[PDB]
Amino acid sequence: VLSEGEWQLVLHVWAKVEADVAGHGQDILIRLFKSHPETLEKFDRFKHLKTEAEMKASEDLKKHGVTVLTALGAILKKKGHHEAELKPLAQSHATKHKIPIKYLEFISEAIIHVLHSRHPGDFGADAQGAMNKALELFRKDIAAKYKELGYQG
Numbered sequence: 001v002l003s004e005g006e007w008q009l010v011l012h013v014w015a016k017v018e019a020d021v022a023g024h025g026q027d028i029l030i031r032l033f034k035s036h037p038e039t040l041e042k043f044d045r046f047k048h049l050k051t052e053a054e055m056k057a058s059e060d061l062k063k064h065g066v067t068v069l070t071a072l073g074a075i076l077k078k079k080g081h082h083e084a085e086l087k088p089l090a091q092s093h094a095t096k097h098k099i100p101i102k103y104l105e106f107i108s109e110a111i112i113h114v115l116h117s118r119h120p121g122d123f124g125a126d127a128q129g130a131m132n133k134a135l136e137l138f139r140k141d142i143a144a145k146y147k148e149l150g151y152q153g
């Protein structure tokens with residue numbers, strides 16, 4: 001499981017991504033596109049965005065980061081029982097956007113990178129391990145959905 005303890009470490013630091021959802025989402029999506037450029041090819045809107053300055057200036061990119069981070073957060077707060085919210089995500093991601101599960105792993109590490117970037121005294125080894133554990137669960141339940149629809153494998 002995640003224990004009660006670890007969900008607590010998870011939701012404690014999410015509450016301070018909540019205080020600036022938009023600069024967080026923006027850092028994460030740039031960390032992604034930067035570490036893994038083939039991900040940008042999945043977005044039609046964002047493939048004009050060659051440099052990092054252009055990325056940071058795009059308002060459209062920032063709105064997206066808000067969309068992902070508040071869907072993500074809605075899932076984290078559901079802790080454990082997160083099916084209602086994770087199903088629609090899986091459907092669209094598998095059968096529309098064509099987002100391989102591997103990319104969900106890339107974005108997980110960008111999230112943990114970015115929260116290390118901004119949250120030292122709240123993001124220590126025990127919260128990192130909680131967080132990694134909660135991105136895992138998320139990635140595994142999506143993966144189940146994917147198997148079932150006949151994507152990825």
Ligand code: HEM
Pocket residue numbers: 039040042043044045064067068069071072088089092093097099103104107
């Ligand atoms: C924590 C991971 C992610 C979450 C929670 C997430 C959440 C969302 C949500 C809420 C939307 C709008 C509704 C929908 O289409 O489902 C969306 C759109 C989209 N996502 Fe994701 N997404 C995630 C990861 C990714 C990744 C890894 C990519 C690309 C590599 C991706 C590519 C897209 C695309 C291309 C769209 C369609 C709209 C647009 O053009 O941006 N998503 N996602």
